[PDB]
Amino acid sequence: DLSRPLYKKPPADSRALGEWGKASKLQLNEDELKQQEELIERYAINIYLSDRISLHRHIEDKRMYECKSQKFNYRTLPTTSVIIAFYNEAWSTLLRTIHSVLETSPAVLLKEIILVDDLSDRVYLKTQLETYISNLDRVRLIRTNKREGLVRARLIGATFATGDVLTFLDCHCECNSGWLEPLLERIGRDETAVVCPVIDTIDWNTFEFYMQIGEPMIGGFDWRLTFQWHSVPKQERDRRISRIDPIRSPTMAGGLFAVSKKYFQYLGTYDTGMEVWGGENLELSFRVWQCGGKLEIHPCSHVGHVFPKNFLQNTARAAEVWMDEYKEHFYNRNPPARKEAYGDISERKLLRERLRCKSFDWYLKNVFPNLHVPEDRPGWHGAIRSRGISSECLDYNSPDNNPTGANLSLFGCHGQGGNQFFEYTSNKEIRFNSVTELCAEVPEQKNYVGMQNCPKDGFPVPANIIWHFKEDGTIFHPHSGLCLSAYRTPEGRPDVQMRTCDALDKNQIWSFEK
Ligand SMILES: CC(=O)N[C@@H]1[C@@H](O)[C@@H](O)[C@@H](CO)O[C@H]1O
């Protein structure tokens, strides 16, 4: 059986703590509780509990039925080097990862596990780790000489790897059965496919493995370039022939992926000119697809990750290198990004040219067509200042939940976008869209302004979200027949309201500023 792993799991034991990835809870006396809380304070993971769960536990496989009946040609699949970087990882989580890879991966395909110690200071990660891994076939340790960060530690590890395919996992993962074959099968069919497992959550407190059932969500972004999940679009459902086929993802949705080593090297690996840590996968995503490259999530490959209990320079760098004439939509909506030192991108431009990468316009149309791209027409986006109360700007401040909870109001003009950033559209909508596509609306028969999700591209614009910015500075709402007016509450607070129109009233006069 060429599916055989290098080491076999012991028989499953349903009496054993956390077997099958089920939740674990211990009965602890009061000293034991103190010990458990101490380790959570130090590790942000329930290490007390991890230490009592088998390093070799089974995870119950709940994948789509078609996944479990797939056949593979083990003689023709590519080999992989598994790369795991760590910094001060607890013993039991670090080792459960290693044993999990060793026990769930076909021996014929697992060339090596390369552990990268990114300048750990835990004493057990010096001598003791090397002694433990000296007993484990194909497991090697590489050590950095300085604190490199996840990406650069990974690069150092990849440099030592000689497998056909690099598979970057992390230091507190547990692999589902059959996780590897679907990645390697696909890359064996298309060497430019960067293929990601579905990343399931392992509970840091209970160690329950929560498997995503059926169709995963996939990766993209909003116009602040913050990562956002979205559902598989109709175009992608229709392109794919089976529901267990790989799914195209506009951006990477986690840190776990398999890529042909030669192909990763050809693309330039990660962007080394990044100085700050974090957010590096946006730049990588754009580069793979524009330089093409496919980025996929594979529904039959599941890896669990213990999620424990900024990087704007990197995000801006991705925009400067890749986004061409669309970067300004980002800067308009995340103004602090304009102030960030994204670094010298001369070498990156040359790499893009050498690789003959396609445009960001191409990316948007072909990779992320649904997504809405703002216009930000000159003179029609920014802050909207009141003529009547000259210190005040239109301002929408909703709770973090309930993005459409509040009413449009006034607040001191600060020039920083966000709650004061708007876009007047060619479809005559006033969009409040630094975060999501929200459209200013007057509900039927009312005289206040709220927000609601904008219509999808190409679909009817409701009558009650149409605004006419008159030549005279009036913001007229033709459906209500009223005009937007500044006023003060009886208590003195500036506010807005819909009033009968009067172009001689300076409280109904407004202007865009940027
Ligand atoms: C830049 C920005 O969004 N600032 C918002 C402001 O516009 C206003 O909504 C206020 C309400 O408390 O919060 C702010 O600091």
Numbering used by the authors: 58 to 366, 374 to 578
From the paper:
The GalNAc-Ts comprise a family of up to 20 isoenzymes possessing a range of kinetic properties and expression patterns. Three distinctive glycosylation modes have been reported: catalytic domain-dependent glycosylation on “naked” peptides and on glycopeptides, hereafter termed short-range glycosylation; and remote lectin domain-dependent glycosylation on glycopeptides, termed long-range glycosylation. The GalNAc-T4 isoform is of particular interest as it is the only isoform capable of glycosylating two out of the five acceptor sites in the partially glycosylated MUC1 mucin tandem repeat in a lectin domain-dependent manner.
To further elucidate the molecular basis of GalNAc-T4’s monoglycopeptide glycosylation preference and rule out one of the two proposed models, we obtained triclinic crystals of GalNAc-T4 that were subsequently soaked with monoglycopeptide 3 and UDP and MnCl2. The resulting crystal allowed us to solve the corresponding structure at a high resolution (1.90 Å). Within the asymmetric unit, two independent GalNAc-T4 molecules were present. The crystal structure shows a compact structure with the typical GT-A fold and the lectin domain located at the N- and C-terminal regions, respectively. Even though the crystals were soaked with a high concentration of peptide 3, UDP and MnCl2, we could only visualize well-defined density for the GalNAc-O-Thr moiety of monoglycopeptide 3 bound to the lectin α-subdomain GalNAc-binding site. The almost absence of density for the peptide backbone of monoglycopeptide 3, is consistent with the STD-NMR results (showing no significant STD with the acceptor peptide residues) and with the weak binding affinity of this peptide (Kd estimated in the mM range), determined by surface plasmon resonance (SPR) experiments in the presence of UDP and MnCl2. A closer inspection at the lectin domain GalNAc-binding site depicts that the GalNAc moiety was tethered by conserved residues, including Asp459, Asn483, Phe475, and His478, of the lectin α-subdomain GalNAc-binding site (equivalent residues in GalNAc-T2 are Asp458, Asn479, Tyr471, and His474). Most of the interactions are through hydrogen bonds in both enzymes, although they also share CH–π interactions between the GalNAc moiety and Phe475/Tyr471. In particular, the structure shows that H4 and H3 of the GalNAc moiety are in closer contact with Phe475 and His478, which is further supported by the STD response (92% for H4 and 72% for H3) observed for these protons in monoglycopeptide 3. As expected and accordingly to model 1, the GalNAc-binding site in GalNAc-T4 is located on the right side of the lectin domain, which requires a rotation of 28° with respect to the homologous site in GalNAc-T2.
